[PDB]
Amino acid sequence: IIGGEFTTIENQPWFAAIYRRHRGGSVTYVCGGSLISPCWVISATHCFIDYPKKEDYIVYLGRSRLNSNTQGEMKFEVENLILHKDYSADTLAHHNDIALLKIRSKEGRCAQPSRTIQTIALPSMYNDPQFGTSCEITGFGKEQSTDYLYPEQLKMTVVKLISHRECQQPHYYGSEVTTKMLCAADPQWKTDSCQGDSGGPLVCSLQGRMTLTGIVSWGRGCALKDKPGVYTRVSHFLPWIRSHTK
Numbered sequence: 477i478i479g480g481e482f483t484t485i486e487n488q489p490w491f492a493a494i495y496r497r498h499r500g501g502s503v504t505y506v507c508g509g510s511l512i513s514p515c516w517v518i519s520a521t522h523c524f525i526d527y528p529k530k531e532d533y534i535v536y537l538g539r540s541r542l543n544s545n546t547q548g549e550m551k552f553e554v555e556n557l558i559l560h561k562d563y564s565a566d567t568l569a570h571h572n573d574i575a576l577l578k579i580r581s582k583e584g585r586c587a588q589p590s591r592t593i594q595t596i597a598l599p600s601m602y603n604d605p606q607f608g609t610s611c612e613i614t615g616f617g618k619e620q621s622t623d624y625l626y627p628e629q630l631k632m633t634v635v636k637l638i639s640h641r642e643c644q645q646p647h648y649y650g651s652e653v654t655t656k657m658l659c660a661a662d663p664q665w666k667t668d669s670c671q672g673d674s675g676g677p678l679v680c681s682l683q684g685r686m687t688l689t690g691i692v693s694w695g696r697g698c699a700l701k702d703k704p705g706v707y708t709r710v711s712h713f714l715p716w717i718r719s720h721t722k
């Protein structure tokens with residue numbers, strides 16, 4: 477997250493921190509995710525497509541720092557890694573950038589909700605917020621495009637949704653951004669999501685309900701003029717999510 481503010485997991489309790497174990501024992505941070513039900517985390521296929529082995533991943537819920545075992549956190553392995561079959565990547569645009577992770581503790585249990593571990597509601601079909609609505613993003617991603625390290629403490633920011641007609645303007649993304657994608661940015665271009673925030677949540681309060689409207693997917697640079705963040709429009713994928721979690 478470029479700009480924004482430092483936060484803690486009690487403010488983002490649906491946030492999942494996903495890591496990968498490498499041969500030799502080293503563990504590195506991969507992507508964010510969101511808890512949609514006790515046994516299921518939703519994220520972005522691009523986070524996993526190059527290492528599609530469920531045994532490699534570690535998922536934490538209730539974790540506020542990259543390298544602290546936060547009090548109340550719970551650690552899980554991935555029982556099933558579901559990637560979208562029509563996922564693809566263009567120079568900028570990522571298509572069907574959505575994945576599901578079925579989680580299990582060593583004792584075989586799913587998440588136990590608590591003050592720091594909670595689900596986030598899915599949207600309803602054909603009901604996304606109007607352009608100009610403010611939404612929040614959360615993640616352990618870069619603080620500046622030139623950084624190589626990720627922040628130790630979790631961050632959040634707030635951005636505004638941009639219409640498809642505006643996002644398709646020539647100086648924006650033209651025809652590269654589709655109706656299955658949602659744009660969101662800062663009007664002054666000072667805050668945004670960035671590398672390492674992928675898979676994380678774009679949460680919008682709509683009709684009084686905190687909703688998982690988007691999943692961080694792609695963008696040209698981070699916080700660049702006329703280059704919004706692009707998110708998987710979760711409402712389009714409700715049939716896919718429902719069928720893959722039954």
Ligand SMILES: N=C(N)c1ccc2cc(NC(=O)Nc3ccccc3)ccc2c1
Nearest residue numbers: 668669670671693694695697698699705
């Ligand atoms: N402007 C944004 N909101 C945004 C959102 C997600 C992003 C994700 C990025 N991920 C990215 O470039 N990943 C990568 C890693 C190794 C080799 C090649 C590429 C980079 C910029 C991003 C920028």
